[PDB]
Amino acid sequence: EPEWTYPRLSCQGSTFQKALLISPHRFGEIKGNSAPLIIREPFVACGPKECRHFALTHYAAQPGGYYNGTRKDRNKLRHLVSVKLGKIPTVENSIFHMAAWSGSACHDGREWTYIGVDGPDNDALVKIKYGEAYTDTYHSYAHNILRTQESACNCIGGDCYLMITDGSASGISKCRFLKIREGRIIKEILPTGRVEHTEECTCGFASNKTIECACRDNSYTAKRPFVKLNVETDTAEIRLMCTKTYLDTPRPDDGSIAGPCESNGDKWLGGIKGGFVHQRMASKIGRWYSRTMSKTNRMGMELYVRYDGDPWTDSDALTLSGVMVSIEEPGWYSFGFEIKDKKCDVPCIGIEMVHDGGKDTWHSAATAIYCLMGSGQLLWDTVTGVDMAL
Amino acid sequence: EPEWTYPRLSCQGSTFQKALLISPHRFGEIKGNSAPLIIREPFVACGPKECRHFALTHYAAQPGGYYNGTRKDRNKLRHLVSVKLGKIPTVENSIFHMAAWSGSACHDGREWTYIGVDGPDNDALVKIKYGEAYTDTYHSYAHNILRTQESACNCIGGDCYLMITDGSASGISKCRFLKIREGRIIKEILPTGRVEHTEECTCGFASNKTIECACRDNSYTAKRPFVKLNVETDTAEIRLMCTKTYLDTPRPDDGSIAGPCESNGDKWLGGIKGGFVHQRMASKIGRWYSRTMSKTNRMGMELYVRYDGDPWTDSDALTLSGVMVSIEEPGWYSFGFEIKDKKCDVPCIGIEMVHDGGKDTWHSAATAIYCLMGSGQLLWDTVTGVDMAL
Amino acid sequence: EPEWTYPRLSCQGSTFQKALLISPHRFGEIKGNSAPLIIREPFVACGPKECRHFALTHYAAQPGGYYNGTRKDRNKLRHLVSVKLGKIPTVENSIFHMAAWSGSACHDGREWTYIGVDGPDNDALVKIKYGEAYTDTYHSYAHNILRTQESACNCIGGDCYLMITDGSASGISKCRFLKIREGRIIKEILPTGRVEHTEECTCGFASNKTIECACRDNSYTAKRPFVKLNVETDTAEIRLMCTKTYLDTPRPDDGSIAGPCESNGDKWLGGIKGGFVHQRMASKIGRWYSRTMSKTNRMGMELYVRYDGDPWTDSDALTLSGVMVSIEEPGWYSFGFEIKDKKCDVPCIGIEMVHDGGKDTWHSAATAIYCLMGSGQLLWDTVTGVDMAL
Amino acid sequence: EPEWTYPRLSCQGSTFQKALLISPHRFGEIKGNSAPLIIREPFVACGPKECRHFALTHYAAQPGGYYNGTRKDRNKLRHLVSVKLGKIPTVENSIFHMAAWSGSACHDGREWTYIGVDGPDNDALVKIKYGEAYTDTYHSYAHNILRTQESACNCIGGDCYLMITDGSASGISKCRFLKIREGRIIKEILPTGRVEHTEECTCGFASNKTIECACRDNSYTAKRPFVKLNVETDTAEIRLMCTKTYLDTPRPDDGSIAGPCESNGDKWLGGIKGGFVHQRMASKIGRWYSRTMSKTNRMGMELYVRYDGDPWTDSDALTLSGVMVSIEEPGWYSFGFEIKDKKCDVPCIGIEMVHDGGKDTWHSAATAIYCLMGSGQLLWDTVTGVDMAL
Ligand SMILES: N=C(N)Nc1cc(C(=O)O)ccc1N1C(=O)CCC1(CO)CO
Ligand SMILES: N=C(N)Nc1cc(C(=O)O)ccc1N1C(=O)CCC1(CO)CO
Ligand SMILES: N=C(N)Nc1cc(C(=O)O)ccc1N1C(=O)CCC1(CO)CO
Ligand SMILES: N=C(N)Nc1cc(C(=O)O)ccc1N1C(=O)CCC1(CO)CO
Ligand SMILES: [Ca+2]
């Protein structure tokens, strides 16, 4: 009988470097003989023995004949699939866990937990799966597209925590947190503080007592709402990050937003999921973030870091760590996960590189990875190498 | 040495929701690069560690060149194949267990048992397989298409029970039950009661002492013959279900059949295999059934439920639970199986969604799944998303 | 540490029935999307946990571009490959063990032993492989196409026995036997008796003290040379079978060969590998043989059996058991192997069904299987279902 | 908990024979249905239970649409992939370990260690991976294409040794050695002696105290620099081999280079990685080398051997052992690895057979293997069997 998964100290290191790239459409030529699935919202989650590359497929492949609708998000064909990290997600390589248009997954040291959301926008549903068995569900509370993270949930000692949210994308979406255990929701936490809008949270353990999240506000601010969940008391609390380096997209020039740490500024309506991961140290804490290069568009991607301080009250601009993707290459959703080494965890940042060619063609993505290893500075940037017209 | 499989209490819950969809032909475009097998009569069966998606292939794929004959049922090329639940049944993903045009399978907690039927219609044969070894056979008694369930057999404490049947589809087909153990038939039970016609039974444990089956009568009634097998004495007994919600197809308006619980009514010649599964509770019993939406055609699919009572004498109409498939989408064979969680069994209903385009083209099917999870009502319906002309 | 494999009593039963068919070219249409390997000389061998389908590929696939030369036998591209029994041997499904144009394999209860032959016809070489390591070799003695069985070698208590042969196909080819152990040849046996010609032997355990073989004589007789190897003393001895049902192809009418059990009769130059397997009983011994239906051509295939007696002196015609393949369907090489059940061995007969369309096109084969199971008579025959022009 | 890997005595034998060939492009016809990856610099490395076929892919396949650039070496798309030895490295069969344009790997008896190099030529990076976790990095010291072996690193008792090098290909490239343990570099050795140029080293254990390497000098000599690393003191030392059979390409006639063992002779600018492996004996040492057949071009490949002596001072010409590849067939990079049998190691020599058709088409390679087994002489040569125009 295996033991439960706990957050440990991150491995020694001080910089991020190009780790691996997964460009399934470098094989989808009309001339080729492969069949990569058309997907979006990819994310990596790892257990003690393996890392898995999850994603949301449109139950279609390239080359294929159902490209129409792949640019849309919610529908009755969307499914959450996954391949082992390092394998091209093809029709046969892949595994379909369930039907869903929003999802998350996390391993608890013993078994996998898959989360999926599907159903009518006004009464959607969150379905928990433990291994091969469907174990539970959660209903919509705001009755407007119940959705989840699009990144790994976080398990500790057997209890897993997962952010959920219901509401308008241009209005109010108060997020919620579910304390899931062995597939069954044993609790539902109501966060305190700034909650006008909080979705697509990238959560991770800052320690054995706290989980933090860098989220997305789609209608009020270019600042990223920041969650701090006290695992010990299952209580949460949110409030806009205070640094000058706004991590959302779109966003105004750094420092452009006048006022205290709670000022939303101009709506800058819209947003994007941002990478975020922790570097746990015996007496210090590293916080790595990623943000698109273009301020208005999803192009490029840079890495930031800030050791210690309270993101809630620290307005000091973050430290630039590197360019993971140039402005000529797509830089869309991003996320964090942590590989488990023998005695330490390895913080990494995955990046969704969408191949957008309009609604008239297929719409898929590549997944570039970057992990903490060694010292110095980020050396190389990433490219998908795909030519959509093939 | 593993221990034997026993039926346990179902997991807590009170509604069925869309679980997973397997549409292998969403990848069989002339333009694509995949190779899904052309099949029919799919069914899921699970062991303690995994669920497998079995089916009957025509040893052909799409796109391919042997579409002629795939709409026929019995032949020398038909084989029983299976992939793990969650994988697309393709030429390479699949495993061929044996040659057969009728089949069943069930895991006994230790090893898989595959059942296959093939041979001349007048002297067909039932072949039992235990793991990789061919272990036994059973001959035709009525000498007219010896056939079996097309759904999982049920094992308890090591002994597995399987319904078989021989006879005319428009005449008399007295079914039989085989008590198989470790691949060898240690008994053959002769059911009592209504037996003029009883085929394609969907059986499952109602408890540790009884196995129940919702079967098909192809020539006498629109009511479903109902089997109750006393596992403790290996004795059976059949008699037409008594509810007003006739579960066969075709069928007349509910309550249309005048008379007592034994009235067959108009022949309504023909039928279809219907889903059926048990929800075991400490002091109550849930019985879930499925029936096509159209009364005359195999279109649509709805879920029913009836807690307690004797289906043999209860004429009270079943309770509508939801629409798993609309009348615009194919709703063919259906069936039940139960996923094994750590401490409870999860009742599910699989549905065969055939892609019928006439005998002039390929004839294959998708498999939509629905499982008990959480409460409330069924939220979403299922679609194959396939456009046969591609 | 696993224990060594020993021959046990066969499972109870008294007839052979169609078990499984492997027609990889039912997916090689120019229109399809699969890639089955072009092969020949297939054979199945099983260990305690799995059966494997070995064969000799021309390192080519259908559809493909290297069909020229596939009808030839020996060459520098031929490799011995294998897939698990039940999987289609495709480019990706397959595993390449070594380069060879003649081969054999057998599992000893602990690890697999692969045998391969390749090299110049005048100085060919036999290479033994144990798992992933190349362990030994044996040189040509007659200096004319050193070749081996094309069926499984037989291991007992850890020592494996394998027939080898060197010589002209139309002249003298004295076969030899190698006692291999853990990959290394610890002995070389020189058979006694009739040895003018003895190749492609189908060997199997008649007991814990004797291995028997039905072989092929390519230039002297239509009778099959018969080997009896005393495992206990590692001594052999050969002499033409004495039944009237000649099992070679070509062959004259049964009983046509005048004289005693040693008469070769007319050369009937040429031959074919024939199926042969043992049915071990507490006090009786079943011997099953297969022979093409046509006397002059490789078409059709029938099953024979003879309980007890000495094939060396028994001239009584064998008992016809059934038609595994009609005269309209190809019936080429055949062979025997035995599946291992929990407490008994299951004798089976595999059949090579070649798709011969001349040297101007591809030349591949299907593998039909038949195993002992239950009683009565053989019910169905086998067909490849392949239309070479697709 | 498994124990550490140590070098043992090689298995008994005295000759090399054709073992296995991996020609993935025997399936890349425009007409076929397969997808082999376009690669280069292949190499095999084995652990106690399996051998893996690593290589450097251009993230492209045949047939495909990105053939331009595959003839170039360094780029942002190159990745180190690997399949189990015996499987065709296809898009789906393969696993991508990391992004790199130079690499190495070795198993330490417990877990795999993958090494990859990528980044700007002037500030490249060496990334160590232990299983699924990124563990360490090493920076460029000469600031000119930091690169590594292109063959397996060598682990002993848990510590693994890997040659690295930085410098000009036509100038000075002083190589370095990294003592890696559990993914982390615990030491960096600076070799003594001739070091003007030393790259692409083929290293292997000559004993439990010494690792030897046959390297490449790209700008000064046709003689192969020879490394001897004292594992016991982690000290190294290099000096040009002294035999008359120059093993580099290009090279002048044997014995053409006048002078003592340290004479570089004419630049013969350029080189190639050469095969080299040890045959450990109780009291003797076999050293096997390979060298292209043509003196000026990468065509053909022959095997050499020299028992005992000091390659540093022995000028006696090596003993010709055989022709693994004729002058009509490509003979490019070559390398050594050792399969692990139950009680001994099996020395083998892999050969890279590039399919060069100019920069206007794809550029991929086949991998022919040869291993020590039995006695006598090398019997057969190897051919790719590929016709690039298909
Ligand atoms: N309002 C949103 N942020 N929605 C949203 C926006 C985008 C985009 O801008 O590209 C993509 C997907 C979604 N999503 C959906 O459409 C339903 C689920 C969800 C991703 O799983 C949001 O979590
Ligand atoms: N009389 C029947 N119910 N036969 C039957 C009917 C249909 C259909 O109406 O679609 C499909 C398959 C069968 N079957 C066969 O043709 C042989 C086996 C069997 C399914 O495995 C019946 O169990
Ligand atoms: N003389 C023979 N029997 N040779 C022979 C004949 C045929 C045939 O008639 O179809 C096929 C293969 C072979 N073989 C070869 O060509 C080399 C090896 C061997 C099969 O592995 C013979 O064992
Ligand atoms: N100077 C060299 N020897 N470079 C070199 C030469 C060739 C060739 O001549 O064919 C091929 C690859 C490389 N390589 C590169 O381009 C970067 C890494 C490396 C192989 O991994 C050299 O180790
Ligand atoms: Ca925003």
Ligand SMILES: [Ca+2]
């Ligand atoms: Ca494939």
Ligand SMILES: [Ca+2]
């Ligand atoms: Ca009916």
Ligand SMILES: [Ca+2]
């Ligand atoms: Ca003959």
Ligand SMILES: [Ca+2]
């Ligand atoms: Ca040189």
